[PDB]
């Protein structure tokens, strides 16, 4: 079971505020501290602050500007970080982590990708990428899917709902005119496709949209 | 873990003068340092414990000093038997650690090699092989070159050389040059020559034997 | 009697509460070391015994108040346990 | 605040050989150092706690060593799944701090 | 009576056993200093007296448990020896 | 008396394991620790681990890979180090040492030379090296012996069972085609040889072979 559960993404207008959540499962103790860590893309881990839910005290990193306020709900077992008056410098992945009061972070959440921008949320368009009519066949075949025109990051691309994990490459998104585009490739023995089925799944949490797309040969 | 730095790695002295080995710990360790001597092919032997305390059976020329991070092993008047590697070791914190060691070498008066050549033995010959062995012994300095001649012609194949470290008895060096041939090719040639050139003589010091 | 047992329980309560409250008071102060519960429990023991290893100390006002409560109650209760053990020992001295 | 220096920032090795990551603290912190692995797009995952203690579910190729100011994370025989960033983290003094990370490449 | 003699013996036993077990518990922990028997014996004395020089301390869990046993038994027995010496002294106070 | 006694050599196939022994004599105390130190040729001393025989706990160097397991037999007063799954990086001299629990190594064993290789054990051939028929005589004479074609290291060469110690040089072995060769020289007053006797003794412990060879002038 995922012990710490976080929303996938939040989009915030410049100067606005957002409230991130972190729902906890598993073993719970009064010695538990919940921490928050900020990671800008291509950067390292940055400690933000901590809260002890069984009492309600929070502490904050003093080397950085205090743009966060920590709370906790003991009923829902959920910690909250309020980020206030956000600039583009606050666009980052925000992890929560549980520490049993002994100094290390045993478990981490998946992180909430926070994007600070004025642009509008846009769900993606998923297109099938099957080989052309005259592509020679090897012992393997490479299929793919195109995820075009979405905002903000991220998207999660799976193949056959996770059962097809090996032979998968999902490329980093490229931004053009305020919308992202990426593609993902999968490579499967050519003798099995399309005798079985190969389907891509694309999750865009900022728009709560999930799409499946079957890759069938050309008719 | 305590890092023990021994610098310099090599210490070159003249005989009879005082020499000092340095051991520096990455943090303060009181007096919890101990010194060991290891001669060539030998086991380490404890010289000084707890930075300065003498050990029974160790010559009084050895003493130690220091506390905190800087420690010194001292030999008041070095003799040839002191040629060895020297290791420091700390016991202040777990785990125990050793320094990387300092080699002591002695600068002595120049000495020409004592050259001897040895023909193959009958026991070896009755087995299908023949080795001509040449000893270049008790010279100084260690730089030396050996040359093998058969019937006046220099040969270089089948010649394996070996050098000893500095000698703990007289501070010299020695070398062995061995030319290995089959019995059938040991026969077919009369003159075998070991030549060897050293800075002690402008002319080489030649030893030779004819199968006659 | 079983007064030593009740004093022991009080001492253990003082140690645990002092550990928890010490971590609660010291986190948030830069340079503080009394910030994880195991070594805070060790520090509570050191405080109750006044053994004086000096490896851990509180640096905040509330951490030092917690230390004072652990000194008063912890030193008193540990003194009760120690007195009980001493009296029991001299009680064994009549045997021989 | 404890500064944790991870040098070098990039570690390039051939497959199967032993690799060592360095973490150096600006002052002595006993053994209160912990190591994390973060793969591309993944969350950090605890590898070693208190400088050398193993974690359940972590391959035995991982070990740690050190105390005071100098700490080492070691991988006995690196394979492709070890490609990631590696972070050290101290809990000796408030606040907790992270090193800047070392990238492993094969 | 000779209860002080029996308390002294118990104290010495506590000191020796605490030295041996402290070295046994602390070796294997990087940075540990309680790893040779002479200074472990010194540390046992420091613990029993609570003199607090703070030059030596255990860093492992079992070393700290050993320290706690040396605190309980060592502080109790040393308190018995000290009480005996005090009573003997005031016993000498009647002479003058 | 030699207080710590170790086998001279052990040859191990790659990926195999070996159990080194260290028999203790002299004074024994419960405060005694037995340590093991590894020394690769031309390198320094490397602490491996320790064991307290009067209880059975062992500790190991954590900066290196744990390729050893320490045990002790209180009856035979013998400590054992099990080296497992050996590579060629484990080929070295392995010393045991006794520490009285006060931090220093008062006594050391002679060391066990451990060679990791697939080659086979081979005893040496010892040949006499006496001067030729027409070698001029000085006040001293130099004799020697040839130790050819053995594996693995080491060999121990004595002269007259140790009574002839001064004037002796034993050269480092040279390896060719998976077998070692060395020679040893001795220098004695020429007036005494061969009026007394000069004999070389060659011990190869990996094959448990010991050989004596008399050096007699040519007939
Ligand atoms: C909520 C308040 C209660 C706190 C509960 C404390 C539980 C104690 C067990 C912790 C084990 C930590 C292991 C570790 O990885 O740390 C080791 C580092 O080498 C050494 O650990 C320690 O030093 C433990 C110190 C506690 C000793 C006090 C004994 C006196 C009764
Ligand atoms: C098995 C458990 C029993 C342990 C037995 C301990 C024997 C004590 C004698 C050790 C002498 C070491 C000499 C040395 O080279 O060290 C000196 C360094 O300058 C200082 O030594 C010391 O500081 C000794 C400390 C012990 C003092 C405690 C006295 C209280 C009764
Ligand atoms: C009365 C005992 C001291 C109270 C401890 C307060 C801990 C929280 C301080 O922020
Ligand atoms: C009960 C007193 C503590 C026991 C000491 C154990 C020492 C060995 C730990 O590895
Ligand atoms: K008391
Ligand atoms: K005190
Ligand atoms: K008292």
Author numbering:
A (entry chain A), F (entry chain A): 1 to 219
B (entry chain B): 1 to 212
C (entry chain C), E (entry chain C): 26 to 121
D (entry chain B): 1 to 106
Show the paper's wording.
The simplest description of the gating cycle in the pore domain of a K+ channel requires at least four distinct kinetic states. However, as a consequence of allosteric coupling between the inner gate and the pore helix near the selectivity filter, opening of the activation gate in many channels leads to a series of structural changes at the selectivity filter that renders it non-conductive (the O/I state), a process known as C-type inactivation. In an attempt to increase the resolution of pore domain states where the inner helix bundle gate is open, a set of cysteine-bridges between adjacent subunits was engineered, using the lower resolution structure of KcsA-OM as a template. This experimental approach, combined with targeted mutations known to affect the stability of the C-type inactivated conformation, allowed the structural determination of KcsA in its ‘transient’ open-conductive (O/O, mutant E71A) and deep C-type inactivated (O/I, mutant Y82A) conformations at near atomic resolutions (2.25 Å and 2.4 Å, respectively).
In KcsA, mutant Y82A (equivalent mutation to T449A in Shaker) also leads to an augmented rate and degree of C-type inactivation (green trace), which it could be interpreted as favoring entry into a deep C-type inactivated state (a collapsed selectivity filter). This represents the highest resolution structure of KcsA’s O/I state available, offering a unique perspective on the interactions between the selectivity filter backbone, permeant ions, and structural waters that stabilize its deep collapsed state. In the O/I-state, the selectivity filter contains 2 K+ ions tightly coordinated at positions 1 and 4, with ion vacancies at positions 2 and 3. Interestingly, Val-76 carbonyls can be seen forming hydrogen bonds with newly resolved structural waters behind KcsA’s selectivity filter. Moreover, as originally reported at lower resolution (and also observed in the low [K+] KcsA structure), the O/I-state pore is collapsed at the Gly-77, where the inter-subunit Cα diameter is reduced from 8 to 6 Å. At the higher resolution of the Locked-open-Y82A structure, a novel network of water molecules appears behind KcsA’s selectivity filter.
